[PDB]
Paper text:
Here, we describe the new and innovative design aspects, fabrication, and experimental implementation of low-cost and micron-sized X-ray-compatible microfluidic sample environments that address diffusion-based crystal formation for crystallographic characterization. In the current investigation, we developed X-ray-compatible MiDs with highly reproducible geometric features suitable for diffusion-based crystal formation for X-ray diffraction experiments at synchrotron sources. High-quality X-ray diffraction data were collected on protein crystals grown directly within the chip, with an exceptionally low background recorded on the images, a clear advantage of the devices while performing in situ macromolecular crystallography experiments.
In the current experiments, Lysozyme crystals were confirmed to grow directly within the channels of the chip, reaching dimensions approximately the width of the channels 14 h after injections. After confirming the appearance of the crystals, the chip was mounted on the PROXIMA-1 beamline of Synchrotron SOLEIL for X-ray diffraction experiments. The method of serial small-wedged data recording was used to automate and simplify the procedure. The structure of the Lysozyme was solved by the molecular replacement method applied to the recorded data merged from 21 independent crystals. The MiD design and conception allow for minimizing the background noise originating from the interaction of the incoming X-rays with the material composing the chip (Online Resource 1). Consequently, the flux deposited on the in situ crystals could be lowered to 3.8·1010 photons/sec without affecting the quality of the diffraction experiments. By reducing the flux of the incoming X-ray beam, the deposited dose on each crystal could be lowered to 1.8 kGy, which is several orders of magnitude smaller than the Garman limit (30 MGy) and, therefore, has the marked advantage of slowing down the impact of radiation damages on the crystals. The final structure of the Lysozyme did not emphasize any markable conformational changes amenable to X-ray radiation damage, resulting in crystallographic statistics of good quality. Overall, the 1.83 Å resolution electron density of the protein is clearly defined around all amino acids, including at the disulfide bridges, a classical trademark of radiation damage. The absence of noticeable damages in the electron density demonstrates the applicability of the MiD in combination with small-wedged serial crystallography for damage-less structural studies.
Author numbering: 1 to 129
Amino acid sequence: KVFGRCELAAAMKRHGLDNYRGYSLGNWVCAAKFESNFNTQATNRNTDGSTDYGILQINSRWWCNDGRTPGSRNLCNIPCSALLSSDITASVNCAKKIVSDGNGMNAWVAWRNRCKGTDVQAWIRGCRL
Ligand code: NA
Ligand code: NA
Ligand code: NA
């Protein structure tokens, strides 16, 4: 499913991401935009053989099992394919574990390079939340 900007903001807010670990909703919408263009089916392969999945591009090297990333962890206890669902619950629950591991949203390279230090509130402007 390809989300609309406001539709995704509302779904993330309902799933408890607004101000989760001090990150306002605009940060999460901004990260989803540059990681996946709001497409839950997005996949991208990394140089090390691991793959990134879903709306927040969660990596199989640490967070999910895809059956093809040797010596990797599955810290979210889920198959990577569950992160491609039109229901964002699994992606959101896994992102909460990632953002709590010590590095905050810096775990998402696109957030650090394209969202951090910008007016992220603009990503939720006009939304009925
Ligand atoms: Na915001
Ligand atoms: Na591979
Ligand atoms: Na980047």
